[PDB]
Enzyme design. Structure first.
Site, PDB file in Angstrom:
ATOM      1  N   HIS A 181      47.275  25.335  37.489  1.00  0.00           N
ATOM      2  CA  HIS A 181      46.381  25.599  36.408  1.00  0.00           C
ATOM      3  C   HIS A 181      47.072  26.062  35.211  1.00  0.00           C
ATOM      4  O   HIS A 181      46.547  25.800  33.997  1.00  0.00           O
ATOM      5  CB  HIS A 181      45.166  26.309  36.590  1.00  0.00           C
ATOM      6  CG  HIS A 181      44.173  25.626  37.780  1.00  0.00           C
ATOM      7  ND1 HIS A 181      44.472  25.650  38.891  1.00  0.00           N
ATOM      8  CD2 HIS A 181      43.136  24.647  37.491  1.00  0.00           C
ATOM      9  CE1 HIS A 181      43.711  25.009  39.698  1.00  0.00           C
ATOM     10  NE2 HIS A 181      42.740  24.556  38.717  1.00  0.00           N
TER      11      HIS A 181
ATOM     12  N   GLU B 119      31.708  14.166  47.153  1.00  0.00           N
ATOM     13  CA  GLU B 119      31.910  12.861  46.327  1.00  0.00           C
ATOM     14  C   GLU B 119      30.621  12.023  45.975  1.00  0.00           C
ATOM     15  O   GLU B 119      30.433  11.538  44.845  1.00  0.00           O
ATOM     16  CB  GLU B 119      33.089  12.220  46.681  1.00  0.00           C
ATOM     17  CG  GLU B 119      34.275  12.698  46.946  1.00  0.00           C
ATOM     18  CD  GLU B 119      34.798  13.426  45.392  1.00  0.00           C
ATOM     19  OE1 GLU B 119      34.606  12.756  44.468  1.00  0.00           O
ATOM     20  OE2 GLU B 119      35.417  14.498  45.705  1.00  0.00           O
TER      21      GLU B 119
END
Lengths: 98, 596
Positions: free
Chosen positions: B487, B357
């Protein structure tokens, strides 16, 4: 809540001359057609406000800038420092600048 | 006046007022996620709907510009994002029914409940529980039953929804000058600017198999190793001529084989490197971890973190009724605001995810000077690749020892190196064939080669052939395996990870050459290499203002997507697979089935 009380000129017909102050706020024509004071196509306001926030990053926070200009024309000069002075001695061969 | 000047003035009017609204919406979203309260919900809604209700008319005015004479490849490129119809090509009824269909599809997918025959009153969901049962258990029959229930109480009712959604999306793409939805998805990997660096939508399709062909022997050897381990595992289920079924992959779709790593341990006696207890013994909190990671990034060469990240961003353990969803994320709110959203703990995975991150945040600063419409990566894979590169390179035992965690006299041998390489391979390359087959299936079903009746059979046969996954229980036409996918039920591209893996491997390999390191690629360390950091920042600074073909020219010397880092990384593992199973033969036969 965002400081929007400060504005800046965004669109101008040309540049600005040195030591010139312009406060003109009129619609800007980006084409070859009149706008009639209406923000239509190719018609934008020359002034845009600022969106200062305390959470904004460094460089976006509002800064205060003041320029001091010094000139020396034929009239006598009148603005300068205090020209500090020493103490007084007596009964001794010295040199002085009274 | 020329049209280019008018377009520049329009962009200057648009971006300044759009950036403030985007920052307001992002700040409202961050406040809503930081404070789980009722008021923040409508605060986010009322600060986010205005962004769309402003961008709609901003894009509305960008059609009267004759976008066929604008030059410099940047003003036209900037206006092209503004010249996006979106979903207004169709009428109100079709658009609203598609929106309702997507909403109800998401709700149905998120509300998947399967009840066991013993207790038809208490069902189980994809949240931990049913998913936990079918991931870390031992019983074969209960795993098969769970797989059948998941595919039978979820994917049965999504078949007509997907059937109409595919044709509606294809029609909307055709109205948007896109004959296929696959072309619409591939439009990200399409550039028609500077000569010699241009790319075509159909070039990605052929490049996919041209880069997948040479990794086939490694996948076949890994499949042979898995089949041998299953020989060591439950007998009378897997055949040495065939291939293992779907529910023994260890996952609901078999994307990752981490759950099968325990069943496929190379040696067993050698344990993996872990200093979590050593981290606790040294009194390591989230602050110490973040500071050490930032020092490592500084040693790499990345710019120093600005103030406010330690304060504005939430770091760890919100604690009391002041709740906050802390799914690991890197937030770029704009206006020079970058934050992390975390619940860090003392573990290796938390360390790697924090590195991931904060590398994402560093890349966010990398393209911060670019305009608002160009504050992104060249393509969707570069961002995630740059995020994961630092996590990949910070897990080396040398880096663990260099930060005062491993013992100074610690020495690594071949066995633990092979164990680490196999564990990494079982997680990284174990999804590439699945991603390839899923993307190809979606592309041809959007193109229209396969008819309505030849929908499930083609998918299952190509899964059997390319991947090596056979039917544990048959399904002809009444289920829909792709429908029960995150997805697919949410309209998210999956080629992003396929490109990202190769991109991150390429960048890590290139830094390995331009970092003065000798030895195996898996032990390569990019720490204490200012030149490598500068070389990476050379491409990171480019952002979306440059084509991805030009972006793949600073880190590596080849613009085309090459795959040799993947083979170069697992060379000792490949040789181990070569010289370990000298009796078993690689590959599988598609005729064999567990049921017939």
């Amino acid at each position: 809540g965002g400081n929007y009380n400060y504005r800046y000129r965004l669109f101008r017909k040309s540049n600005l001359k040195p030591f010139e102050r312009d406060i003109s706020t009129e619609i800007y024509q980006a084409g070859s057609t009149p706008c009639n004071g209406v923000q239509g196509f190719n018609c934008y306001f020359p002034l845009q406000s600022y969106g200062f926030q305390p959470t904004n990053g460094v460089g976006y926070q509002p800064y205060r800038v003041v320029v001091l200009s010094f000139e020396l024309l034929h009239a006598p000069a009148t603005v300068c420092g205090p020209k500090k002075s020493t103490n007084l001695v007596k009964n001794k061969c010295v040199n002085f600048n009274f | 006046s020329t049209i280019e000047e008018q377009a520049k003035t329009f962009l200057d009017k648009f971006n300044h007022e759009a950036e403030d609204l985007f920052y307001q919406s992002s700040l409202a979203s961050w406040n809503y996620n930081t404070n789980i309260t009722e008021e923040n919900v409508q605060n986010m809604n009322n600060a986010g709907d205005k962004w769309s209700a402003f961008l709609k008319e901003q894009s509305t005015l960008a059609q009267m510009y004759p976008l066929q004479e604008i030059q410099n490849l940047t003003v036209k490129l900037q206006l092209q994002a503004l010249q996006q119809n979106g979903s207004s090509v169709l009428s109100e009824d079709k658009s609203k029914r598609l929106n309702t269909i997507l909403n109800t599809m998401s709700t149905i997918y998120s509300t998947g409940k399967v009840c066991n025959p013993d207790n038809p009153q208490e069902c189980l969901l994809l949240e931990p529980g049913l998913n936990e049962i079918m991931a870390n258990s031992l019983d074969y029959n209960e795993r098969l039953w769970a797989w059948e229930s998941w595919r039978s109480e979820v994917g049965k009712q999504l078949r007509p929804l997907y059937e109409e959604y595919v044709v509606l999306k294809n029609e909307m793409a055709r109205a948007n000058h896109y004959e296929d939805y696959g072309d619409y998805w591939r439009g990200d990997y399409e550039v028609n600017g500077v000569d010699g660096y241009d790319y075509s939508r159909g070039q990605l399709i052929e490049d996919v198999e041209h880069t997948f062909e040479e990794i086939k022997p490694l996948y076949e050897h890994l499949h042979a190793y898995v089949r041998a381990k299953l020989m060591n595992a439950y007998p009378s289920y897997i055949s040495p001529i065939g291939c293992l079924p779907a529910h023994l992959l260890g996952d609901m779709w078999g994307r990752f084989w981490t759950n099968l790593y325990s069943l496929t341990v190379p040696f067993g006696q050698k344990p993996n490197i872990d200093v979590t207890d050593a981290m606790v013994d040294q009194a390591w909190d989230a602050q110490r971890i973040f500071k050490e990671a930032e020092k490592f990034f500084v040693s790499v060469g990345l710019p120093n973190m600005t103030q406010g990240f330690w304060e504005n961003s939430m770091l760890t353990d919100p604690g009391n009724v002041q709740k906050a969803v802390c799914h690991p994320t890197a937030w770029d709110l704009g206006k020079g605001d970058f934050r992390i959203l975390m619940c860090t703990k003392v573990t290796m995975d938390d360390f790697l995810t924090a590195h991931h991150e904060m590398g994402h945040i560093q890349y966010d600063m990398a393209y911060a000077a670019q305009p608002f419409l160009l504050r992104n990566g060249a393509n969707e894979g570069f961002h995630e690749a740059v995020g994961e590169i630092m996590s990949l390179s910070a897990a080396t035992p040398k880096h663990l020892k260099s930060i005062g965690l491993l013992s100074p006299d610690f020495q690594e041998d071949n066995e633990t190196e092979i164990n680490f390489l196999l564990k990494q391979a079982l997680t990284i390359v174990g999804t590439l064939p699945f991603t390839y087959m899923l993307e190809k299936w979606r592309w041809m079903v959007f193109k229209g080669e396969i008819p309505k009746d030849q929908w499930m059979k083609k998918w299952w046969e190509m899964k059997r052939e390319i991947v090596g996954v056979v039917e544990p229980v048959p399904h002809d036409e009444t289920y829909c395996d792709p429908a029960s996918l995150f997805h697919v039920s949410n309209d998210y591209s999956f080629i992003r990870y396929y490109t990202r893996t190769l991109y991150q491997f390429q960048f890590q390999e290139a830094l390995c050459q331009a970092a003065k390191h000798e030895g195996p690629l898996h032990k390569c360390d990019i720490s204490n290499s200012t030149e490598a950091g500068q070389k990476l920042f050379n491409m990171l600074r480019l952002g979306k203002s440059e084509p991805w073909t030009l972006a793949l020219e600073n880190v590596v010397g080849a613009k085309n997507m090459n795959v040799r880092p993947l083979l170069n990384y697992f060379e000792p593992l490949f040789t181990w697979l070569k010289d370990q199973n000298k009796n078993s033969f690689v590959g599988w036969s598609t005729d064999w089935s567990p049921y017939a």
